[PDB]
């Protein structure tokens, strides 16, 4: 009676992931399917070599989360994922909850701590508070996306893209880097600044010997709402984490996973999960302990 | 098309609850049932009304199982903010039973705690699975431990504010005016030594005029520090500060919406996606905020 699951794609999440299934008492673990070949359990290039899947979580770079998880709930195999394109999510459970339907599977979808956990969050925040603004502050933490961007840029030999919350959705930028031969930081400095990623915002470029000490996975969020309950004023909330942002990301992969079990075919964000259903075991425990 | 909502109960719950109901752009209000109102169809039975969805029931905690009971025996789905934590689960089986008979849906304990701080609390212990949570109240009044004062010997007046000291310990700062002929020394004994009182550490205080000092504002902050899978030291919280009867309002119009999308049965706010406390299709709040 335990869930068997599958970790698909090995990169960073995945490691997590599977560190939050294995301590989730609730989960037996599969298998590991791996994209790029490369000890106590399995680890194949394709999911049919594992046996008898009931969940997998797919730890896939966003761009790819769509066409590994509709494979995967084609065969009947429910899916987790953490896709963060925020702007690409309706169009991924359009797609996932079509595939869904036709198999019998369940597809949980964007679901790491932003989007994911976070969605929650706001969502309860936007309910409860229906008029007024929300601010979702990020960092201080690495960005993967901006270092990503950073090291296309010409004469950058390492990057690291540091977002620093300046509040009401405000972020500054803080990038260090490794140059290149031949080249100079003022001219670096001018192309990162100049890009798409970071025309809009404040940002610093930093010159350094080494990027891979300054690296950390600590990162966090502080949410805001304040606004207007009913027709009363000036009401106010806030959410914060200070948290290992691959590690967090890890184990809601597995609530999320233990959550698909449990819906009806079709897929879903967060915000469609019944909050107990992200729990191991049945609900009078967690309604007796947590309500 | 519009939700026909019916309040029942027209205390300080009530009164916030059919202000946040006005507001909403998906009800239609039915009217208020009763032992500001002037537009709506003011009565004393709720067949009484016409054509009624849901029912926010804004009774004392006391109350809330006989009166949802009634209403949901006739068809009727419900909304209620009974607090008391620990009749939570006998609630939802007497209400679900009901419930599940009528064809209606209930959904219980929604105010901000027990309610919507219920849902923060459920989410941090899901993704951050070990360690502990702490739930930290106010400074606001104490609606229960206020009650348990006013029935002290002597005490003519009362307002008891409970004050956070961190990991779940509160103070209680208890103002009372006195009854002609008892002493402070008495009443303030005979507080400190009632159940309600006599685990925490409490201050009473004589004043001249206990209305003065009574505040709506309230507020939690609660954290959980603990393990996402097998790594430490992760971080959480979460913090209001609000006006408490206004909140408890709004959230009973959420759970009355959220009533009319589930099938038969009782719920807590756990149990309830949280996109079902916002109002019309889900599309324009996954593309807002997920």
């Known amino acids: 009676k335990k869930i068997r699951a599958a970790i698909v794609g090995y990169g ?6 599977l560190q939050a299934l294995r301590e989730a008492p609730d989960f037996e673990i599969a298998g590991i399917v791996r994209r790029n070949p490369a000890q106590p359990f399995r680890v194949v290039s394709d999911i049919e070599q594992l046996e008898s899947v009931d969940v997998a979580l797919v730890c896939s770079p966003s761009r790819e989360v769509e066409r590994t998880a509709l494979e995967i709930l084609k065969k009947g195999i429910c899916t987790a994922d953490s896709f963060d394109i925020h702007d690409g999510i309706l169009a991924l ?5 079509d ?11 964007a679901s790491g701590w932003d989007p994911g956990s976070d969605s929650v969050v706001r969502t309860l925040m936007q309910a409860i508070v229906p008029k007024g603004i929300t601010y979702t502050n990020f960092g201080p933490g690495m960005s993967m996306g901006h270092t990503v961007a950073v090291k296309a840029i010409d004469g ?3 990057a690291l893209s540091m977002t620093i919350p300046l509040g009401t959705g405000v972020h500054r ?4 880097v ?6 100079n930081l003022e001219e670096v400095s001018a192309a990162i600044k100049a890009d798409e990623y970071f025309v809009h915002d404040e940002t610093h470029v930093i010159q350094v010997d080494e990027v891979d000490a300054l ?13 207007v309950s009913g027709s009363t004023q000036n009401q106010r909330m806030s959410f914060d984490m200070e948290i290992n942002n691959p590690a967090l990301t890890g184990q809601v992969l597995v609530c999320a996973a233990r959550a698909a079990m449990r819906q009806q075919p079709g897929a879903y964000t967060l915000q469609e999960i019944p909050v107990i259903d992200l729990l191991p075991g049945d609900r009078e425990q967690w309604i007796g302990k947590l309500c």
């Open 99 to 109: 595939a869904a339907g036709k198999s019998g599977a369940a597809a949980v979808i």
């Open 215 to 227: 690296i950390d996975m600590g990162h966090g969020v502080r949410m805001v709402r304040k606004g």
């Open 156 to 158: 950058v030999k390492a």
């Open 93 to 97: 459970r359009r797609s996932l909850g």
């Open 178 to 183: 490794e140059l290149l031969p031949g080249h």
């Open 173 to 176: 930028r803080m990038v260090y």
């Open 12 to 17: 960073n999440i995945g490691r997590y992931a």
